[PDB]
Structure formats: structure tokens, C-alpha cells
């Protein structure tokens, strides 16, 4: 049998079976976590559709098969020694019959803690610590670069276009919020702090958008055509941030994510976009 993880008790983490310390064949069924596992040098043999559509992550998991959580046959034949899932997955019991499962309830640990937590689970503390120390220094330095341009108290709102809907996001639901609010310590407008932050996200009617945007807005979308009718509208064009050219449009295919690999890309992209807003 496998050498075992110490399986620490961590908020949000549930273990099904004996988790290996050094898994050799991991199936990741939760896009939140795939890039954390890659950062810690795990061999991923299965990943999700969102993972494959994230160009930053996809480059690192070319040999992994795309699978869904219902793919019991394909997952079995991948011969995993570990499966990682989100806690809301429909069929964790069936997955745990195939291999040991780590199930994570989102948001119980923050985007940085998740990495050091995996460091404890897999005895990869050094790799996690090195990344986290560098991240702390780099983000503080970049925070200075961007606030030099905007002012330290400029407000930012995180937004996404999805289907025909409009979402706002807080500090810990992807779409750039970790970078903008946690890494750069930008404030959000009061209405976003009150109505969005605790909730994580808020699906909004388009006509009230002006009320939620202050100095800057970051907008994630999967395709560059989705926002067209909104963007040309008098409503949108009346927003001071829009008039100032403080709209930052980003590609959701990577910006949905919160993992170290995706966030490295988001960090550089957002730094450059803020600087570019004053070109
Ligand atoms: O984990 C993150 C950031 C936070 C996040 O989006 N999560 O889903 C984490 C798990 C949240 C707890 C379970 N909640 C839900 O499943 C509710 C639906 C959901 O995924 N949400 O994010 C809620 C707001 C978005 C709803 C519309 N769906 C999308 O934007 C698809 C991309 C979308 O939201 N996805 O999750 C697929 C890509 C995600 C890449 C990893 N990103
Ligand atoms: Fe989500
Ligand atoms: Na933080
Ligand atoms: Na999608
Ligand atoms: Zn700060
Ligand atoms: Zn039109
Ligand atoms: Zn203009
Ligand atoms: Zn400006």
C-alpha cells in the first residue's frame, strides 16, 4: 500500500479513504484546485473541461485526459491513486470507490492557505512556502506600481459577463478579485462591499450597473463579443469609469481561476492593464 498523507484536519477538507502522501496519478475534478496540484509538481492524469480551456494551465497538463465526475469508467481506467473534488459534487461516494478522495468545500480556506494546506497534506511544505514568500514580496511591489498610477484609494469592481447575465464578484471568487482586492489591496465601492463581498458574487440587472462602479471596473468574459450592446449603451457610456477609460477587459478562460499558475498570469496582466489605462 501507499505511504500516507498525515491527513491534517483543515476547515473545508474531507478525506475519503487513505490519502497517499506522494500520489503518482491524480485526477482533478475541481478546476479550483488543478493548478495548485500542478504547482506542487503532481502528475495529473485527468483534469476538467475548464482546465483544458485555460491556456495557461492547459500547457502544463497536455498528457492529462479531460474527464467529468460522471466518467466512472474513464476515471477507473486512468488508474488514479487520488481524486480531488469540490464538496458539492453530485457523486463523491461513487468516486471514493475508485480511489481515495480529497473533497474541498470552497471558501473555508483562502486562495493562499489552500496552497500551504496542500503542502501539509503532501509534505511539500518547502515548495509551498517558497512560492508564498515570493508571492507576498512580488504582490507588495506590484501594488506600489499600480497605486502610483491610480492613487491608493481608487475603487475597483470585479464583473463578469456570462450567458446573457451580469455578475459582480468580491475579493475571493476569481475573475481578478484575489489580485485586485487581496494582492493589490484595492477598495471596492461601498455598494459592492455591502451587497457583493459577503455573498461572494451577485447576479445583477444591467440597468443598475452605474451604482456599483467607482474608479475602475475589471470585466471577465469568455468571448470579446458578449458585452457589445451593453458597452455601446448610453447607460454604460454615462459611467464615469467608462468615460475615463478605466475599463479593463480580461479573458475569463484564465481569469475564472484562483490557482497559482493562473494567478501568476492574471497578476502580470492586471499590472500591465492598470499601467496601460494611463497611456
Ligand atoms: O473556483 C474558482 C473561483 C470560484 C468559483 O467560481 N467557484 O465555482 C468555486 C466553488 C464555489 C462553490 C460552489 N458554488 C457553485 O457551484 C455556484 C456556481 C458557480 O460556480 N459560481 O462560481 C457562482 C457564480 C457563477 C455562476 C455562473 N457560472 C460561471 O461563471 C462558470 C464559471 C465558474 O464559475 N466555474 O466555477 C468554472 C471555472 C472555475 C475555475 C476555478 N475558479
Ligand atoms: Fe464557479
Ligand atoms: Na491575502
Ligand atoms: Na463556460
Ligand atoms: Zn497593501
Ligand atoms: Zn446596438
Ligand atoms: Zn472615450
Ligand atoms: Zn485614468
Short mmCIF file of C-alpha atoms and ligand atoms in Angstrom, two decimals:
data_model
loop_
_atom_site.label_atom_id
_atom_site.label_comp_id
_atom_site.label_asym_id
_atom_site.label_seq_id
_atom_site.Cartn_x
_atom_site.Cartn_y
_atom_site.Cartn_z
CA UNK A 1 0.00 0.00 0.00
CA UNK A 2 0.87 3.70 -0.38
CA UNK A 3 2.84 5.88 2.03
CA UNK A 4 0.12 8.05 3.56
CA UNK A 5 -0.54 11.73 3.92
CA UNK A 6 -0.72 12.90 7.54
CA UNK A 7 -4.29 13.93 6.63
CA UNK A 8 -4.41 17.05 8.81
CA UNK A 9 -7.78 18.31 9.97
CA UNK A 10 -8.31 21.52 7.99
CA UNK A 11 -11.50 23.56 7.65
CA UNK A 12 -13.28 22.56 4.46
CA UNK A 13 -11.19 19.43 3.81
CA UNK A 14 -12.80 15.97 3.94
CA UNK A 15 -10.90 12.76 3.24
CA UNK A 16 -12.48 9.58 1.87
CA UNK A 17 -10.03 6.73 2.29
CA UNK A 18 -6.32 6.82 2.96
CA UNK A 19 -4.82 9.71 1.03
CA UNK A 20 -1.35 8.99 -0.45
CA UNK A 21 1.45 11.36 0.53
CA UNK A 22 3.11 11.07 -2.88
CA UNK A 23 0.31 10.28 -5.35
CA UNK A 24 1.62 9.36 -8.79
CA UNK A 25 -1.64 9.54 -10.81
CA UNK A 26 -4.02 12.30 -9.77
CA UNK A 27 -7.44 13.04 -11.23
CA UNK A 28 -8.55 16.61 -10.58
CA UNK A 29 -12.31 17.10 -10.88
CA UNK A 30 -12.31 20.59 -9.36
CA UNK A 31 -10.92 23.39 -11.52
CA UNK A 32 -10.36 25.46 -8.38
CA UNK A 33 -7.54 23.14 -7.35
CA UNK A 34 -5.91 21.73 -10.52
CA UNK A 35 -3.22 24.41 -10.74
CA UNK A 36 -2.34 24.09 -7.06
CA UNK A 37 -1.60 20.41 -7.66
CA UNK A 38 0.47 21.31 -10.73
CA UNK A 39 2.41 23.96 -8.75
CA UNK A 40 3.32 21.22 -6.27
CA UNK A 41 4.60 19.02 -9.15
CA UNK A 42 1.82 16.42 -9.12
CA UNK A 43 1.28 14.22 -12.14
CA UNK A 44 -2.25 14.91 -13.29
CA UNK A 45 -3.71 12.12 -15.41
CA UNK A 46 -7.23 13.62 -15.53
CA UNK A 47 -8.46 17.23 -15.47
CA UNK A 48 -11.69 19.15 -16.19
CA UNK A 49 -13.10 20.86 -19.27
CA UNK A 50 -12.47 24.29 -17.72
CA UNK A 51 -8.85 23.26 -17.09
CA UNK A 52 -8.36 22.34 -20.75
CA UNK A 53 -9.87 25.70 -21.82
CA UNK A 54 -7.47 27.66 -19.58
CA UNK A 55 -4.45 28.24 -21.89
CA UNK A 56 -2.04 28.82 -19.02
CA UNK A 57 -2.95 25.62 -17.23
CA UNK A 58 -3.57 23.59 -20.40
CA UNK A 59 0.09 23.92 -21.44
CA UNK A 60 1.09 22.01 -18.27
CA UNK A 61 -1.47 19.18 -18.50
CA UNK A 62 -1.28 18.15 -22.16
CA UNK A 63 -0.95 14.46 -21.22
CA UNK A 64 -3.96 14.58 -18.87
CA UNK A 65 -7.31 13.31 -20.20
CA UNK A 66 -10.31 15.59 -19.93
CA UNK A 67 -12.90 13.86 -17.72
CA UNK A 68 -16.11 14.73 -15.91
CA UNK A 69 -17.11 13.47 -12.47
CA UNK A 70 -19.66 11.12 -14.08
CA UNK A 71 -16.88 9.39 -16.08
CA UNK A 72 -16.58 6.46 -13.69
CA UNK A 73 -15.33 4.13 -16.43
CA UNK A 74 -12.72 6.51 -17.82
CA UNK A 75 -11.56 7.52 -14.35
CA UNK A 76 -11.26 3.86 -13.31
CA UNK A 77 -9.17 3.06 -16.38
CA UNK A 78 -6.83 6.00 -15.67
CA UNK A 79 -5.85 4.03 -12.53
CA UNK A 80 -5.67 7.08 -10.25
CA UNK A 81 -4.23 6.91 -6.76
CA UNK A 82 -6.00 10.15 -5.78
CA UNK A 83 -9.12 12.05 -6.88
CA UNK A 84 -9.72 15.71 -5.87
CA UNK A 85 -13.29 17.08 -5.90
CA UNK A 86 -15.34 20.03 -4.77
CA UNK A 87 -17.69 19.30 -1.87
CA UNK A 88 -20.84 19.97 -3.95
CA UNK A 89 -20.05 17.22 -6.45
CA UNK A 90 -23.08 15.02 -7.10
CA UNK A 91 -21.41 11.52 -6.72
CA UNK A 92 -18.49 11.55 -4.26
CA UNK A 93 -19.43 8.11 -2.88
CA UNK A 94 -19.00 6.50 -6.31
CA UNK A 95 -15.68 8.28 -6.87
CA UNK A 96 -14.33 7.14 -3.49
CA UNK A 97 -14.87 3.52 -4.60
CA UNK A 98 -12.29 4.14 -7.36
CA UNK A 99 -9.54 5.85 -5.37
CA UNK A 100 -9.07 7.94 -2.20
CA UNK A 101 -10.76 11.33 -2.48
CA UNK A 102 -9.98 14.77 -1.10
CA UNK A 103 -13.19 16.82 -1.08
CA UNK A 104 -12.85 20.59 -0.52
CA UNK A 105 -15.63 22.96 0.49
CA UNK A 106 -14.94 26.25 -1.25
CA UNK A 107 -14.03 29.34 0.74
CA UNK A 108 -13.24 27.72 4.11
CA UNK A 109 -9.55 28.47 3.38
CA UNK A 110 -8.35 31.42 1.31
CA UNK A 111 -6.53 31.26 -2.01
CA UNK A 112 -3.10 31.29 -0.33
CA UNK A 113 -3.98 28.99 2.56
CA UNK A 114 -5.16 26.35 0.07
CA UNK A 115 -1.57 26.06 -1.23
CA UNK A 116 0.06 25.75 2.18
CA UNK A 117 -2.70 23.29 3.17
CA UNK A 118 -1.78 21.08 0.21
CA UNK A 119 1.81 21.49 1.34
CA UNK A 120 0.86 19.91 4.66
CA UNK A 121 -1.24 17.17 3.03
CA UNK A 122 1.53 16.12 0.61
CA UNK A 123 4.59 17.03 2.74
CA UNK A 124 5.56 19.70 0.16
CA UNK A 125 5.87 22.48 2.67
CA UNK A 126 9.10 23.86 1.20
CA UNK A 127 7.70 24.28 -2.30
CA UNK A 128 4.56 25.96 -0.96
CA UNK A 129 6.49 28.24 1.39
CA UNK A 130 8.88 29.37 -1.35
CA UNK A 131 6.03 30.25 -3.68
CA UNK A 132 4.09 32.07 -0.95
CA UNK A 133 7.09 34.14 0.19
CA UNK A 134 7.85 35.21 -3.38
CA UNK A 135 4.16 35.97 -3.96
CA UNK A 136 4.00 38.19 -0.88
CA UNK A 137 7.04 40.22 -1.93
CA UNK A 138 6.05 40.46 -5.61
CA UNK A 139 2.44 41.45 -4.92
CA UNK A 140 3.52 44.16 -2.47
CA UNK A 141 5.91 45.54 -5.10
CA UNK A 142 3.29 45.45 -7.84
CA UNK A 143 0.74 47.04 -5.51
CA UNK A 144 3.08 50.04 -5.29
CA UNK A 145 3.49 50.16 -9.08
CA UNK A 146 -0.25 50.21 -9.77
CA UNK A 147 -1.21 52.54 -6.90
CA UNK A 148 1.46 55.00 -8.10
CA UNK A 149 -0.75 55.45 -11.20
CA UNK A 150 -4.27 55.22 -9.75
CA UNK A 151 -3.85 56.51 -6.23
CA UNK A 152 -4.02 54.12 -3.28
CA UNK A 153 -7.72 54.67 -2.55
CA UNK A 154 -9.08 54.22 -6.11
CA UNK A 155 -12.07 51.85 -6.09
CA UNK A 156 -12.31 48.73 -8.25
CA UNK A 157 -15.27 46.48 -9.08
CA UNK A 158 -14.93 42.92 -10.38
CA UNK A 159 -17.53 41.98 -13.01
CA UNK A 160 -18.19 39.06 -15.35
CA UNK A 161 -20.38 38.56 -18.38
CA UNK A 162 -21.83 35.04 -18.50
CA UNK A 163 -24.57 33.86 -20.83
CA UNK A 164 -26.92 36.87 -21.02
CA UNK A 165 -26.26 37.76 -17.37
CA UNK A 166 -24.03 40.18 -15.49
CA UNK A 167 -22.26 39.15 -12.28
CA UNK A 168 -20.34 41.20 -9.75
CA UNK A 169 -17.72 39.48 -7.60
CA UNK A 170 -15.97 40.18 -4.32
CA UNK A 171 -12.41 39.54 -3.19
CA UNK A 172 -12.43 35.73 -3.29
CA UNK A 173 -14.44 34.40 -6.24
CA UNK A 174 -11.93 34.66 -9.08
CA UNK A 175 -12.32 37.00 -12.06
CA UNK A 176 -9.32 39.01 -10.83
CA UNK A 177 -10.72 39.70 -7.34
CA UNK A 178 -7.88 37.96 -5.50
CA UNK A 179 -5.36 40.07 -7.42
CA UNK A 180 -7.25 43.38 -7.21
CA UNK A 181 -8.63 43.21 -3.68
CA UNK A 182 -6.25 40.83 -1.85
CA UNK A 183 -2.88 41.20 -3.64
CA UNK A 184 -3.18 44.91 -4.51
CA UNK A 185 -5.42 45.89 -1.58
CA UNK A 186 -7.76 47.99 -3.70
CA UNK A 187 -11.00 49.00 -2.07
CA UNK A 188 -14.35 48.30 -3.73
CA UNK A 189 -17.26 50.80 -3.79
CA UNK A 190 -19.43 50.72 -0.66
CA UNK A 191 -22.35 49.14 -2.54
CA UNK A 192 -20.12 46.28 -3.70
CA UNK A 193 -18.72 45.79 -0.18
CA UNK A 194 -22.28 45.71 1.24
CA UNK A 195 -24.12 43.71 -1.43
CA UNK A 196 -21.42 41.51 -3.02
CA UNK A 197 -18.43 40.81 -0.75
CA UNK A 198 -20.01 38.55 1.89
CA UNK A 199 -22.19 36.88 -0.72
CA UNK A 200 -19.14 36.21 -2.96
CA UNK A 201 -20.99 37.13 -6.14
CA UNK A 202 -24.20 38.85 -7.26
CA UNK A 203 -26.17 38.44 -10.48
CA UNK A 204 -27.29 41.96 -11.37
CA UNK A 205 -29.78 43.58 -13.74
CA UNK A 206 -27.78 45.63 -16.28
CA UNK A 207 -29.60 48.92 -15.63
CA UNK A 208 -28.21 49.29 -12.07
CA UNK A 209 -24.52 48.79 -13.02
CA UNK A 210 -23.55 52.51 -12.65
CA UNK A 211 -24.43 52.31 -8.95
CA UNK A 212 -21.72 49.66 -8.38
CA UNK A 213 -18.75 51.17 -10.28
CA UNK A 214 -16.33 53.76 -8.92
CA UNK A 215 -12.86 54.43 -10.34
CA UNK A 216 -12.21 51.18 -12.28
CA UNK A 217 -14.05 48.07 -13.43
CA UNK A 218 -12.47 44.74 -14.40
CA UNK A 219 -14.71 42.65 -16.68
CA UNK A 220 -14.19 38.97 -17.41
CA UNK A 221 -15.78 37.29 -20.44
CA UNK A 222 -15.20 34.13 -22.49
CA UNK A 223 -15.57 35.93 -25.82
CA UNK A 224 -14.99 39.51 -26.85
CA UNK A 225 -18.43 39.99 -28.46
CA UNK A 226 -20.69 39.27 -25.46
CA UNK A 227 -20.64 42.79 -23.95
CA UNK A 228 -21.31 44.73 -27.21
CA UNK A 229 -24.87 46.00 -26.63
CA UNK A 230 -24.05 46.95 -23.04
CA UNK A 231 -20.80 48.70 -23.94
CA UNK A 232 -22.32 50.95 -26.59
CA UNK A 233 -25.36 51.89 -24.47
CA UNK A 234 -25.88 55.43 -23.16
CA UNK A 235 -26.21 53.80 -19.73
CA UNK A 236 -22.72 52.30 -19.86
CA UNK A 237 -21.15 55.30 -21.62
CA UNK A 238 -22.53 57.60 -18.87
CA UNK A 239 -20.48 55.79 -16.19
CA UNK A 240 -17.51 57.96 -15.09
CA UNK A 241 -15.11 54.98 -15.08
CA UNK A 242 -16.08 54.28 -18.70
CA UNK A 243 -15.58 57.94 -19.69
CA UNK A 244 -12.14 57.88 -18.05
CA UNK A 245 -11.14 54.69 -19.93
CA UNK A 246 -10.84 52.76 -16.68
CA UNK A 247 -12.42 49.56 -18.02
CA UNK A 248 -10.15 46.51 -18.04
CA UNK A 249 -11.46 43.62 -20.15
CA UNK A 250 -9.96 40.21 -19.39
CA UNK A 251 -10.27 36.66 -20.73
CA UNK A 252 -12.37 34.54 -18.37
CA UNK A 253 -10.84 31.33 -19.73
CA UNK A 254 -7.91 32.06 -17.36
CA UNK A 255 -9.48 34.78 -15.18
CA UNK A 256 -12.13 32.44 -13.72
CA UNK A 257 -9.32 30.73 -11.81
CA UNK A 258 -7.65 31.23 -8.44
CA UNK A 259 -4.71 28.77 -8.60
CA UNK A 260 -1.02 29.80 -8.52
CA UNK A 261 -0.39 29.24 -12.24
CA UNK A 262 -3.45 31.15 -13.38
CA UNK A 263 -2.85 33.92 -10.84
CA UNK A 264 0.73 34.49 -12.00
CA UNK A 265 -0.68 35.29 -15.44
CA UNK A 266 -3.53 37.39 -14.03
CA UNK A 267 -1.10 39.34 -11.84
CA UNK A 268 1.11 40.41 -14.74
CA UNK A 269 -1.90 41.04 -16.99
CA UNK A 270 -3.67 43.27 -14.46
CA UNK A 271 -0.50 45.16 -13.57
CA UNK A 272 0.04 45.91 -17.26
CA UNK A 273 -3.62 46.81 -17.83
CA UNK A 274 -3.71 49.29 -14.95
CA UNK A 275 -0.50 50.92 -16.15
CA UNK A 276 -1.91 50.97 -19.73
CA UNK A 277 -5.08 52.78 -18.62
CA UNK A 278 -2.95 55.91 -18.33
CA UNK A 279 -1.07 55.54 -21.64
O1 LIG B 1 -13.03 28.31 -8.13
C1 LIG B 1 -12.95 29.30 -8.84
C2 LIG B 1 -13.45 30.65 -8.43
C3 LIG B 1 -14.69 30.48 -7.59
C4 LIG B 1 -15.73 29.72 -8.34
O2 LIG B 1 -16.20 30.11 -9.41
N1 LIG B 1 -16.20 28.51 -7.82
O3 LIG B 1 -17.14 27.89 -8.59
C5 LIG B 1 -15.75 27.83 -6.63
C6 LIG B 1 -16.76 26.93 -5.99
C7 LIG B 1 -17.92 27.73 -5.45
C8 LIG B 1 -18.88 26.94 -4.56
C9 LIG B 1 -19.95 26.17 -5.32
N2 LIG B 1 -20.84 27.15 -5.92
C10 LIG B 1 -21.42 26.93 -7.20
O4 LIG B 1 -21.12 25.98 -7.81
C11 LIG B 1 -22.28 28.00 -7.80
C12 LIG B 1 -21.96 28.23 -9.31
C13 LIG B 1 -20.54 28.70 -9.56
O5 LIG B 1 -19.65 28.02 -9.98
N3 LIG B 1 -20.31 30.02 -9.26
O6 LIG B 1 -18.99 30.42 -9.38
C14 LIG B 1 -21.23 31.04 -8.86
C15 LIG B 1 -21.11 32.27 -9.77
C16 LIG B 1 -21.01 31.97 -11.26
C17 LIG B 1 -22.24 31.30 -11.86
C18 LIG B 1 -22.17 31.13 -13.36
N4 LIG B 1 -21.15 30.22 -13.82
C19 LIG B 1 -19.87 30.62 -14.27
O7 LIG B 1 -19.50 31.76 -14.26
C20 LIG B 1 -19.00 29.49 -14.78
C21 LIG B 1 -17.53 29.62 -14.40
C22 LIG B 1 -17.40 29.17 -12.96
O8 LIG B 1 -17.92 29.79 -12.05
N5 LIG B 1 -16.73 27.96 -12.67
O9 LIG B 1 -16.74 27.60 -11.38
C23 LIG B 1 -15.93 27.12 -13.56
C24 LIG B 1 -14.42 27.63 -13.58
C25 LIG B 1 -13.85 27.86 -12.23
C26 LIG B 1 -12.36 27.98 -12.20
C27 LIG B 1 -11.99 27.96 -10.73
N6 LIG B 1 -12.49 29.18 -10.14
FE1 LIG B 2 -17.75 28.96 -10.14
NA1 LIG B 3 -4.43 37.99 1.07
NA1 LIG B 4 -18.35 28.25 -19.78
ZN1 LIG B 5 -1.43 46.98 0.73
ZN1 LIG B 6 -26.61 48.21 -30.81
ZN1 LIG B 7 -13.55 57.81 -24.53
ZN1 LIG B 8 -7.15 57.47 -15.81
#
